[PDB]
Amino acid sequence: VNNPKENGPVKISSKVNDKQVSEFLKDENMEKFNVKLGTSKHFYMFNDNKNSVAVGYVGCGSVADLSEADMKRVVLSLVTMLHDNKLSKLTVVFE
Amino acid sequence: SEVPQVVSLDPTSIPIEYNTPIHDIKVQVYDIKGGCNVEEGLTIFLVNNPGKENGPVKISSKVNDKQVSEFLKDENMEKFNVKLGTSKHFYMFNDNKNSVAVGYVGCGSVADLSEADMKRVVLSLVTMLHDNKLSKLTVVFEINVDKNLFRFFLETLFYEYMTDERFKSTDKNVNMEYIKHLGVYINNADTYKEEVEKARVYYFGTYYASQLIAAPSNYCNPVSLSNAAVELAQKLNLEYKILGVKELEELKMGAYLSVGKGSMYPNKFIHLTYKSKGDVKKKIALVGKGITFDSGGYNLKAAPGSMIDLMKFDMSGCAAVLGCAYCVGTLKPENVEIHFLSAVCENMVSKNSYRPGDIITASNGKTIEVGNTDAEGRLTLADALVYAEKLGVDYIVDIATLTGAMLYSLGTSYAGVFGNNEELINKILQSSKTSNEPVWWLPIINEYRATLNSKYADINQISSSVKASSIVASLFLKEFVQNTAWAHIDIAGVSWNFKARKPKGFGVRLLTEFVLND
Amino acid sequence: SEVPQVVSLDPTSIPIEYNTPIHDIKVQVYDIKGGCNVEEGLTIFLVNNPGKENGPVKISSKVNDKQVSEFLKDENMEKFNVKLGTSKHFYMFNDNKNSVAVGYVGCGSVADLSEADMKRVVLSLVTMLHDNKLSKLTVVFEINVDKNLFRFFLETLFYEYMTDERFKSTMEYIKHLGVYINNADTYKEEVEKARVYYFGTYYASQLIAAPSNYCNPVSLSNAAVELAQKLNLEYKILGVKELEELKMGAYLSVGKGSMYPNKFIHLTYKSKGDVKKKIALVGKGITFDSGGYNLKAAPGSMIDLMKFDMSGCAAVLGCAYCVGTLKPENVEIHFLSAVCENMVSKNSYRPGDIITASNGKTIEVGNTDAEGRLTLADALVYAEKLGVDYIVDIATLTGAMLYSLGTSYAGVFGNNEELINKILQSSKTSNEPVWWLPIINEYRATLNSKYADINQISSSVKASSIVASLFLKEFVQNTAWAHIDIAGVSWNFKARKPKGFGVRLLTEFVL
Amino acid sequence: ASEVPQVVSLDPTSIPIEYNTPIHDIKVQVYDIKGGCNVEEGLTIFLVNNPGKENGPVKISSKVNDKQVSEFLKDENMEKFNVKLGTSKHFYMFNDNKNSVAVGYVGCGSVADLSEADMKRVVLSLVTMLHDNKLSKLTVVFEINVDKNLFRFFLETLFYEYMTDERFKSTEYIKHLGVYINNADTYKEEVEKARVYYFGTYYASQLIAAPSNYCNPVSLSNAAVELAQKLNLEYKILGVKELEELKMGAYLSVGKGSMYPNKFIHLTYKSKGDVKKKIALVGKGITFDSGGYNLKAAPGSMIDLMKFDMSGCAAVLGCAYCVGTLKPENVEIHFLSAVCENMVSKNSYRPGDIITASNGKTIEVGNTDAEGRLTLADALVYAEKLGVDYIVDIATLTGAMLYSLGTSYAGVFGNNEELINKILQSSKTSNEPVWWLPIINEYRATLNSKYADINQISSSVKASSIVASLFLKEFVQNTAWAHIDIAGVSWNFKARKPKGFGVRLLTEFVLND
Ligand SMILES: CC(C)(C)OC(=O)N[C@H](C(=O)NO)c1ccc(-n2cccn2)cc1
Ligand SMILES: CC(C)(C)OC(=O)N[C@H](C(=O)NO)c1ccc(-n2cccn2)cc1
Ligand SMILES: CC(C)(C)OC(=O)N[C@H](C(=O)NO)c1ccc(-n2cccn2)cc1
Ligand SMILES: [Zn+2]
Ligand SMILES: [Zn+2]
Ligand SMILES: [Zn+2]
Ligand SMILES: [Zn+2]
Ligand SMILES: [Zn+2]
Ligand SMILES: [Zn+2]
């Protein structure tokens, strides 16, 4: 996620086919986080099927067009969660 | 009192923040043997697993919520581990179908956390506070810690949580929202309650010193530093006295005055005094090195690795002593009389500066041959130590960023302590343990004394041969304490936090515990 | 206005020579069609040989003299070659039974001479002028050069011919210059443009070469006022009191340790027509760079050269002369320079000091020797408030240029693709070489200060020229801006003198 | 004994060693000062002080059974001299028997109790008179108060400083030493122990002072075997083939660029009694430290001194002599040293090279000049495999020691408080000053390598001495271990000679443990 402004709030636009996760991604909950390039937050919670899921975001700054360096900082933030989590699957949503 | 300027845009005072967001935090401590309530903000569990390294997470505390207790069940938590520093955030709904945030911080597999270990735990906690707009934080202790470590928890938490933005103009932080409430669940909570407000005072004493050190040399000078000390004494109600150049000339402090000759700022000797209302027992003088900027003088810091842009911290000792003044003046210990001393000046390059080779006379009559203008600290301390002993005190303790050699001896974590009295040193070491500011005892090797033998003056400022700068410097200072128990703490290596790019305020809690446990 | 002194023997003004020996040279341009006349003075033929490396000399021009023509016959000249830089002198009698001096300079084997080649040609020619007492020089172009290269010939010739003796205690320049070329009519207008471009370059050269005890913040601003008066540019010199009013804390901080008060130079040229582009030219004006408490004591710091640290200011002022003389239309130009001195004193600013710029941004000083970007910062803010279309700064900012482009090419940075392109063409037509260097944003994070809004310098990144450019970019909010780093090209180390680099480049930019 | 390789025939193939020294020929007699002093033969020196009155006048209190000398020592004559520490005077005259005798004094200051350093200055002043006199007998009169250890320290320092090494020179000594002191009978037993401690120290001195062309891995190992044979110690010298089998890759890597093969020294002393405590003494044995490809080219790197980089091994061998001579009971001691040479060659190891120790730990080399800890690593692993109770290593490891304790005090690190206290105790009785330095675990993270198990050095942390200990600690799994860094105290820079530091310290540790 980005915010075209600077250190802006996180806003999720995509529709999520899960009620529990959808409540988490509501503007009020996500507005407490900012889009500073590289900043990230992830939470563990139960979805509609009472299954354990981890959800989060990675800040992509205030610029609409990310550079190679910008994308590099984004990927590294992502890898940090992968290295600190015993996950079976990673899902990335490009907003 | 009036700060001299070169241009009208030059600052005439050090900006100081007294009322910090931390002081607005309402802190409540509950006993864990009653269960935990989860409602507002983030609730963090401090959890370990003794023996089983990177062990699984197990929540032992009773949670006064059915939904949260089921969430926190062992079956759920077993995929997470207690690796020291590790942390995770949880999202869930409570019994009232309300959204609550829960998480933990790994405290490792060892039962007894060290000063460094607890420090790492607190840092993980602060990361959770950062980038999140929380109104209330609640910490649940599922580990065993004593009162000192618990207090150390709060001190470190408050300090690291706090952000210094005194010098931010247009790069201030628009997401800087601090919590308003701190809840603490612990075992035998009644015993820990008294540590809360002791931590807050210790916090600000440390943060106060941090503010003075971090303040650049154009803001923080001999005049502005002494003025701030006067202001602090007035808010505390301590006797204070600021000696100017004329009084210092009368007192024949030629070593101290020589160092500041090249500065546009007049020398200022800070003298604060705290006297307890009761039969005085121990009388203490705390002496801090107060060089607002160390250019090195004509022995300019031009060599690679000299870190000249850092030398705003050369008054860290003075800052530590003043921070102690706040703590002592606030806690009001009994049966003690404390003198807070610092010979403040600036070591600059000018036509009026003193030269390498110059021979100067100290207030005790001793003549000194200056071999290096960059060894000015011991020179200022020399006249300060003499002044201290004239007060007829029981203990003289100085603290200063004296020798860079400390970085090669003890490094950045442990400070070095020297002295002429075995008993006083142990008090410092003991105070180090209870304050959790690490200090190691270093020897004053008398065999090196001969290298300070000057051909013309009574004594040399520095040695020409010996590379043991910390020991040699201590040998110098000892020549200015005739018949009093004296200790010297060299905090050159531990004063500045290079990784975090900020001061530690090292020495404030150490000295306060020293004054209090005495 | 009044220059402060320590002793009565201290200079109170920069010695400036306006009317130079070059200006007394009568220059005439003739068309080669009709033959070349000699007899008088020294006559030099510029000859090349396309294809052959060190091929034989062949004179192509028709010579209006029987004696000289026979002497200059191919058979006689075939023992000589056209190797670049070569020169020869001939003695003979003309049609009038008079003794005449003739010779040539090799222009190589390439048909199209480059700027460096032509420069090497001029040095060879000037060598003939120095050890010989001539009244007239005659040059015959038997090579192909365009108008720009022709103008460059004259500029370089005039510049190298001229000798600066303002500081000599302890002679006879030519009075006439004749030029034979084809299409003479088209090149005639280039002559006086060369004369002007020459002095603009030479003017700046005098200011740069002038030592810091002669050229100081007060005397330099006075010279600029004097220059504005010999021209007719609006001028205003801001003193410390005005700078305090304008809250220029970065600029004022650098000069705190100096005995000379800060002086902000502001010259303005306004066209007597409907203005189109408004331009601010900003030059670094450090009359001496000691480095401050970050003293230039390290090996290779070259402290004895730091009188040239006002080279940017000199270039801007040199541009002012050409523009004020040539009177371009539809343009309004502001010539700006934050002038001061970076010294060591009890009053100097310190490493670690936090200062406030005029745009409100607070800056943490990590190195007092990086004073240039600090002065430019307040100047760039001052420039942008003028509401201009283009802001271009020129400065001897970073020594790293010596490791990137060397001594021939200057580096240009900017926030506008269009502005950069104008500079590059100006580089081509002015024949002052410039190469486009990138502002790498990934390095910006190194300027993130813990206490101040921004860091003055980087602790890690060694790409100083780019990092410094990142700093300056933080003080141009919404205007096309370019930055020319002339640290490496300002001083001609081999010749022991300044180049006056930037005057012709900026003038071409304005034109 | 292996054959030492040569480049030319003029290259030495063995270390010249002096076993029978003139000191061993000195007859020592101790008399009680209460009975009065006899003056007759040789030079008689009085050790006098003046408590309180600094640089005070000299006053001789002892009664001398000679009229001529007695008039000389009268207060009126001696008061013209002062007791400034190190000051000395001596005159030649005829005694009651018309015999030529020399009498004098050495100033012991205004302090009643001399320190180890102070006593050193006294001996040097004394030795100066011995080097300028062809005397048959020296007599020292103690008019100062000294304990049993300090008296023995007197003799050791006297013997050591008196002795001059002339093995490489070519282009007398007293036969009697008389001592007047109080409670002479109690000090008598210290005499012959001083002689042994003397040679143990001087022996190590011979090894250290010996240049790298004489003292190399082969010649030094041969010397260790010879010493073991003269004492009757079990000995074993491991060659490259055996070292390869034991997988000592760290130790082998440092010596790869040398023309001299690596040699692992293993000496053992076993008591003719029921063994109780088993001890391994490990000394760093770098015959020359050029620094490798990280060449010692920086100013102050003192490359011409790096023949002394085997000072640790020399101390251990010196200890081997003392123990093998004094023959302690209920103890088994292993004297270990992985000896090699750190040179520059096509075969040398490179910065960045990753190597494997005998314990399986892989190491990333960040600086070839940090070769000591690499050799010690494999040595420490070998030691622990012997199944010992105590492991103590001694090495000239870090130059930072010059910035911490200087040239007088050695540094001690460890993983066991009790063992460290023993070393500190050993320091007091041996009078070889040592200070306890901390192993700060917080710095351990700087040794985390990106590719290897562990880093050889830190890139950031400047506490080099502490970082090195953190390194070494990774090669001692479950044994009491202490580490003595003698880099700063090993060489006497002013006197231009080795101290043989550690020999007496280690021997006292072995004897008192
Ligand atoms: C006397 C001498 C030359 C051996 O040591 C110093 O000059 N030390 C300087 C100094 O100015 N002491 O007053 C010094 C002190 C501290 C540091 N230091 C650098 C980081 C932390 N401390 C560096 C240099
Ligand atoms: C601060 C740093 C290292 C990033 O850049 C400089 O030190 N620049 C200095 C300077 O004084 N800038 O104001 C510098 C160094 C060398 C040159 N220089 C050297 C040859 C030609 N120019 C110019 C400037
Ligand atoms: C920081 C480092 C690892 C590069 O250097 C050292 O800590 N010590 C080197 C060394 O490892 N040598 O093998 C060292 C050790 C001793 C000295 N030394 C110099 C005089 C006495 N000792 C100098 C450098
Ligand atoms: Zn200093
Ligand atoms: Zn200092
Ligand atoms: Zn500079
Ligand atoms: Zn500059
Ligand atoms: Zn080495
Ligand atoms: Zn070594």
PDB file of N, CA and C in Angstrom, chain B residues 6-10 164 167-171 214 216-219 262 264 293 295 300 309 312 346 348-349 500-503, chain C residues 244 247-249 252 256 293-295 344-347 350-354 360-362 364 366 448-453 455:
ATOM      1  N   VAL B   6      27.346  36.081  18.090  1.00  0.00           N
ATOM      2  CA  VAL B   6      28.076  36.608  16.945  1.00  0.00           C
ATOM      3  C   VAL B   6      27.082  37.223  15.967  1.00  0.00           C
ATOM      4  N   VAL B   7      25.970  36.525  15.761  1.00  0.00           N
ATOM      5  CA  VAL B   7      24.852  37.053  14.988  1.00  0.00           C
ATOM      6  C   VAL B   7      23.581  36.966  15.826  1.00  0.00           C
ATOM      7  N   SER B   8      22.553  37.711  15.433  1.00  0.00           N
ATOM      8  CA  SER B   8      21.310  37.751  16.197  1.00  0.00           C
ATOM      9  C   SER B   8      20.562  36.420  16.153  1.00  0.00           C
ATOM     10  N   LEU B   9      20.915  35.570  15.195  1.00  0.00           N
ATOM     11  CA  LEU B   9      20.240  34.286  15.028  1.00  0.00           C
ATOM     12  C   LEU B   9      20.822  33.217  15.951  1.00  0.00           C
ATOM     13  N   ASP B  10      21.921  33.547  16.622  1.00  0.00           N
ATOM     14  CA  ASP B  10      22.535  32.630  17.577  1.00  0.00           C
ATOM     15  C   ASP B  10      21.647  32.462  18.805  1.00  0.00           C
ATOM     16  N   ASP B 164      13.148  12.849  21.164  1.00  0.00           N
ATOM     17  CA  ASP B 164      13.588  14.232  21.310  1.00  0.00           C
ATOM     18  C   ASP B 164      13.429  14.986  19.994  1.00  0.00           C
ATOM     19  N   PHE B 167      14.765  20.033  18.257  1.00  0.00           N
ATOM     20  CA  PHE B 167      15.475  20.669  17.156  1.00  0.00           C
ATOM     21  C   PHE B 167      14.864  20.338  15.797  1.00  0.00           C
ATOM     22  N   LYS B 168      13.644  19.810  15.804  1.00  0.00           N
ATOM     23  CA  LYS B 168      12.960  19.500  14.557  1.00  0.00           C
ATOM     24  C   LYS B 168      12.120  20.716  14.176  1.00  0.00           C
ATOM     25  N   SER B 169      12.338  21.243  12.976  1.00  0.00           N
ATOM     26  CA  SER B 169      11.578  22.395  12.487  1.00  0.00           C
ATOM     27  C   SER B 169      10.431  22.014  11.554  1.00  0.00           C
ATOM     28  N   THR B 170      10.754  21.236  10.527  1.00  0.00           N
ATOM     29  CA  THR B 170       9.831  20.960   9.434  1.00  0.00           C
ATOM     30  C   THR B 170       9.898  19.478   9.119  1.00  0.00           C
ATOM     31  N   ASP B 171      10.587  18.754   9.994  1.00  0.00           N
ATOM     32  CA  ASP B 171      10.706  17.310   9.893  1.00  0.00           C
ATOM     33  C   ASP B 171      10.167  16.669  11.173  1.00  0.00           C
ATOM     34  N   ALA B 214      22.797  16.007  24.013  1.00  0.00           N
ATOM     35  CA  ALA B 214      22.373  16.021  22.617  1.00  0.00           C
ATOM     36  C   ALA B 214      22.317  17.436  22.050  1.00  0.00           C
ATOM     37  N   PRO B 216      23.383  20.763  20.737  1.00  0.00           N
ATOM     38  CA  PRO B 216      24.618  21.181  20.063  1.00  0.00           C
ATOM     39  C   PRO B 216      25.344  22.295  20.809  1.00  0.00           C
ATOM     40  N   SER B 217      26.620  22.484  20.490  1.00  0.00           N
ATOM     41  CA  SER B 217      27.478  23.398  21.236  1.00  0.00           C
ATOM     42  C   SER B 217      27.096  24.863  21.045  1.00  0.00           C
ATOM     43  N   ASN B 218      26.355  25.160  19.981  1.00  0.00           N
ATOM     44  CA  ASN B 218      25.898  26.526  19.748  1.00  0.00           C
ATOM     45  C   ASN B 218      24.717  26.871  20.651  1.00  0.00           C
ATOM     46  N   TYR B 219      23.959  25.850  21.041  1.00  0.00           N
ATOM     47  CA  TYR B 219      22.899  26.018  22.029  1.00  0.00           C
ATOM     48  C   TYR B 219      23.448  25.849  23.441  1.00  0.00           C
ATOM     49  N   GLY B 262      40.469  30.539  25.194  1.00  0.00           N
ATOM     50  CA  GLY B 262      40.239  30.741  23.776  1.00  0.00           C
ATOM     51  C   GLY B 262      38.779  30.780  23.370  1.00  0.00           C
ATOM     52  N   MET B 264      34.762  32.313  23.363  1.00  0.00           N
ATOM     53  CA  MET B 264      34.012  33.562  23.402  1.00  0.00           C
ATOM     54  C   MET B 264      33.090  33.561  24.614  1.00  0.00           C
ATOM     55  N   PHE B 293      32.247  22.063  24.246  1.00  0.00           N
ATOM     56  CA  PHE B 293      32.772  21.563  22.981  1.00  0.00           C
ATOM     57  C   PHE B 293      34.279  21.371  23.061  1.00  0.00           C
ATOM     58  N   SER B 295      37.305  21.005  20.728  1.00  0.00           N
ATOM     59  CA  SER B 295      37.949  21.058  19.423  1.00  0.00           C
ATOM     60  C   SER B 295      39.338  20.446  19.521  1.00  0.00           C
ATOM     61  N   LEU B 300      44.440  20.371  17.640  1.00  0.00           N
ATOM     62  CA  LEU B 300      43.144  20.177  17.001  1.00  0.00           C
ATOM     63  C   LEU B 300      42.856  18.716  16.683  1.00  0.00           C
ATOM     64  N   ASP B 309      32.980  15.936  15.491  1.00  0.00           N
ATOM     65  CA  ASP B 309      31.586  16.368  15.412  1.00  0.00           C
ATOM     66  C   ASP B 309      30.759  15.808  16.565  1.00  0.00           C
ATOM     67  N   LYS B 312      30.332  17.458  21.300  1.00  0.00           N
ATOM     68  CA  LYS B 312      29.324  18.195  22.052  1.00  0.00           C
ATOM     69  C   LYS B 312      28.987  17.439  23.332  1.00  0.00           C
ATOM     70  N   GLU B 346      34.760  26.012  27.328  1.00  0.00           N
ATOM     71  CA  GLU B 346      34.829  25.545  25.951  1.00  0.00           C
ATOM     72  C   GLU B 346      36.274  25.575  25.473  1.00  0.00           C
ATOM     73  N   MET B 348      38.545  25.895  22.579  1.00  0.00           N
ATOM     74  CA  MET B 348      38.530  26.363  21.198  1.00  0.00           C
ATOM     75  C   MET B 348      39.910  26.795  20.718  1.00  0.00           C
ATOM     76  N   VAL B 349      40.022  27.049  19.420  1.00  0.00           N
ATOM     77  CA  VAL B 349      41.262  27.547  18.845  1.00  0.00           C
ATOM     78  C   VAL B 349      41.142  29.036  18.552  1.00  0.00           C
ATOM     79  N   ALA B 500      22.298   3.951  18.191  1.00  0.00           N
ATOM     80  CA  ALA B 500      21.025   4.660  18.260  1.00  0.00           C
ATOM     81  C   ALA B 500      21.203   6.144  17.940  1.00  0.00           C
ATOM     82  N   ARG B 501      22.461   6.554  17.814  1.00  0.00           N
ATOM     83  CA  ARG B 501      22.836   7.933  17.512  1.00  0.00           C
ATOM     84  C   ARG B 501      22.308   8.925  18.543  1.00  0.00           C
ATOM     85  N   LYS B 502      22.425   8.583  19.820  1.00  0.00           N
ATOM     86  CA  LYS B 502      21.948   9.460  20.880  1.00  0.00           C
ATOM     87  C   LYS B 502      22.679   9.150  22.175  1.00  0.00           C
ATOM     88  N   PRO B 503      22.624  10.081  23.137  1.00  0.00           N
ATOM     89  CA  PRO B 503      23.273   9.890  24.437  1.00  0.00           C
ATOM     90  C   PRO B 503      22.562   8.839  25.280  1.00  0.00           C
TER      91      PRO B 503
ATOM     92  N   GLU C 244      20.136  38.832   8.857  1.00  0.00           N
ATOM     93  CA  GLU C 244      19.490  38.473  10.110  1.00  0.00           C
ATOM     94  C   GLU C 244      17.981  38.601   9.945  1.00  0.00           C
ATOM     95  N   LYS C 247      16.685  35.813   8.043  1.00  0.00           N
ATOM     96  CA  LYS C 247      16.821  34.570   8.794  1.00  0.00           C
ATOM     97  C   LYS C 247      17.668  33.552   8.040  1.00  0.00           C
ATOM     98  N   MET C 248      18.750  34.038   7.446  1.00  0.00           N
ATOM     99  CA  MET C 248      19.655  33.185   6.694  1.00  0.00           C
ATOM    100  C   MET C 248      20.711  32.588   7.633  1.00  0.00           C
ATOM    101  N   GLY C 249      20.276  31.642   8.461  1.00  0.00           N
ATOM    102  CA  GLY C 249      21.119  31.095   9.507  1.00  0.00           C
ATOM    103  C   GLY C 249      22.230  30.180   9.039  1.00  0.00           C
ATOM    104  N   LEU C 252      24.891  32.604   7.369  1.00  0.00           N
ATOM    105  CA  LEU C 252      25.534  33.430   8.390  1.00  0.00           C
ATOM    106  C   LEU C 252      26.447  32.612   9.298  1.00  0.00           C
ATOM    107  N   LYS C 256      30.696  33.155  10.650  1.00  0.00           N
ATOM    108  CA  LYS C 256      30.798  33.592  12.041  1.00  0.00           C
ATOM    109  C   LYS C 256      32.244  33.784  12.500  1.00  0.00           C
ATOM    110  N   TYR C 293      36.790  24.430  11.703  1.00  0.00           N
ATOM    111  CA  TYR C 293      37.368  23.528  12.695  1.00  0.00           C
ATOM    112  C   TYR C 293      37.641  22.152  12.093  1.00  0.00           C
ATOM    113  N   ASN C 294      36.954  21.839  10.999  1.00  0.00           N
ATOM    114  CA  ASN C 294      37.335  20.705  10.167  1.00  0.00           C
ATOM    115  C   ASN C 294      38.456  21.139   9.233  1.00  0.00           C
ATOM    116  N   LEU C 295      39.561  21.574   9.832  1.00  0.00           N
ATOM    117  CA  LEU C 295      40.665  22.191   9.107  1.00  0.00           C
ATOM    118  C   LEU C 295      41.215  21.303   8.000  1.00  0.00           C
ATOM    119  N   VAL C 344      39.026  29.720  11.176  1.00  0.00           N
ATOM    120  CA  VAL C 344      39.077  29.141  12.512  1.00  0.00           C
ATOM    121  C   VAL C 344      39.209  30.251  13.546  1.00  0.00           C
ATOM    122  N   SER C 345      38.262  30.299  14.474  1.00  0.00           N
ATOM    123  CA  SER C 345      38.218  31.366  15.463  1.00  0.00           C
ATOM    124  C   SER C 345      37.401  30.941  16.672  1.00  0.00           C
ATOM    125  N   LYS C 346      37.413  31.764  17.715  1.00  0.00           N
ATOM    126  CA  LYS C 346      36.580  31.517  18.882  1.00  0.00           C
ATOM    127  C   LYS C 346      35.111  31.692  18.521  1.00  0.00           C
ATOM    128  N   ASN C 347      34.867  32.420  17.437  1.00  0.00           N
ATOM    129  CA  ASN C 347      33.513  32.738  17.004  1.00  0.00           C
ATOM    130  C   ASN C 347      33.017  31.851  15.864  1.00  0.00           C
ATOM    131  N   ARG C 350      30.760  25.311  14.985  1.00  0.00           N
ATOM    132  CA  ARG C 350      31.411  24.048  15.305  1.00  0.00           C
ATOM    133  C   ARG C 350      30.756  22.861  14.618  1.00  0.00           C
ATOM    134  N   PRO C 351      31.529  21.786  14.417  1.00  0.00           N
ATOM    135  CA  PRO C 351      30.960  20.499  14.007  1.00  0.00           C
ATOM    136  C   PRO C 351      29.961  20.006  15.047  1.00  0.00           C
ATOM    137  N   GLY C 352      28.744  19.693  14.613  1.00  0.00           N
ATOM    138  CA  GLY C 352      27.702  19.262  15.524  1.00  0.00           C
ATOM    139  C   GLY C 352      26.667  20.344  15.762  1.00  0.00           C
ATOM    140  N   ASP C 353      27.047  21.589  15.486  1.00  0.00           N
ATOM    141  CA  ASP C 353      26.142  22.726  15.627  1.00  0.00           C
ATOM    142  C   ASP C 353      24.891  22.551  14.774  1.00  0.00           C
ATOM    143  N   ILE C 354      23.740  22.890  15.341  1.00  0.00           N
ATOM    144  CA  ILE C 354      22.490  22.858  14.592  1.00  0.00           C
ATOM    145  C   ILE C 354      22.054  24.277  14.251  1.00  0.00           C
ATOM    146  N   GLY C 360      13.289  27.598   7.036  1.00  0.00           N
ATOM    147  CA  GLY C 360      12.832  26.997   8.276  1.00  0.00           C
ATOM    148  C   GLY C 360      13.472  25.663   8.610  1.00  0.00           C
ATOM    149  N   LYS C 361      14.086  25.026   7.619  1.00  0.00           N
ATOM    150  CA  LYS C 361      14.713  23.726   7.830  1.00  0.00           C
ATOM    151  C   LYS C 361      15.952  23.833   8.714  1.00  0.00           C
ATOM    152  N   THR C 362      15.994  23.020   9.763  1.00  0.00           N
ATOM    153  CA  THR C 362      17.147  22.977  10.655  1.00  0.00           C
ATOM    154  C   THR C 362      18.186  21.986  10.137  1.00  0.00           C
ATOM    155  N   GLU C 364      21.949  19.902  10.840  1.00  0.00           N
ATOM    156  CA  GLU C 364      23.012  19.460  11.735  1.00  0.00           C
ATOM    157  C   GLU C 364      24.352  19.408  11.009  1.00  0.00           C
ATOM    158  N   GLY C 366      27.892  18.316  10.343  1.00  0.00           N
ATOM    159  CA  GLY C 366      28.764  17.195  10.643  1.00  0.00           C
ATOM    160  C   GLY C 366      30.197  17.481  10.238  1.00  0.00           C
ATOM    161  N   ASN C 448      19.274  11.732   6.797  1.00  0.00           N
ATOM    162  CA  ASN C 448      18.284  11.744   7.869  1.00  0.00           C
ATOM    163  C   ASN C 448      18.931  11.972   9.230  1.00  0.00           C
ATOM    164  N   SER C 449      18.740  13.168   9.779  1.00  0.00           N
ATOM    165  CA  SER C 449      19.317  13.519  11.073  1.00  0.00           C
ATOM    166  C   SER C 449      18.447  13.041  12.235  1.00  0.00           C
ATOM    167  N   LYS C 450      19.090  12.719  13.353  1.00  0.00           N
ATOM    168  CA  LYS C 450      18.385  12.265  14.549  1.00  0.00           C
ATOM    169  C   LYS C 450      17.679  13.403  15.277  1.00  0.00           C
ATOM    170  N   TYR C 451      18.265  14.594  15.228  1.00  0.00           N
ATOM    171  CA  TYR C 451      17.740  15.722  15.987  1.00  0.00           C
ATOM    172  C   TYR C 451      17.304  16.875  15.090  1.00  0.00           C
ATOM    173  N   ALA C 452      18.078  17.139  14.043  1.00  0.00           N
ATOM    174  CA  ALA C 452      17.738  18.198  13.099  1.00  0.00           C
ATOM    175  C   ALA C 452      16.856  17.646  11.984  1.00  0.00           C
ATOM    176  N   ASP C 453      16.305  18.541  11.169  1.00  0.00           N
ATOM    177  CA  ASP C 453      15.473  18.139  10.041  1.00  0.00           C
ATOM    178  C   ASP C 453      16.257  17.329   9.017  1.00  0.00           C
ATOM    179  N   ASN C 455      20.585  16.168   7.648  1.00  0.00           N
ATOM    180  CA  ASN C 455      22.031  16.165   7.834  1.00  0.00           C
ATOM    181  C   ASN C 455      22.748  16.982   6.764  1.00  0.00           C
TER     182      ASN C 455
END
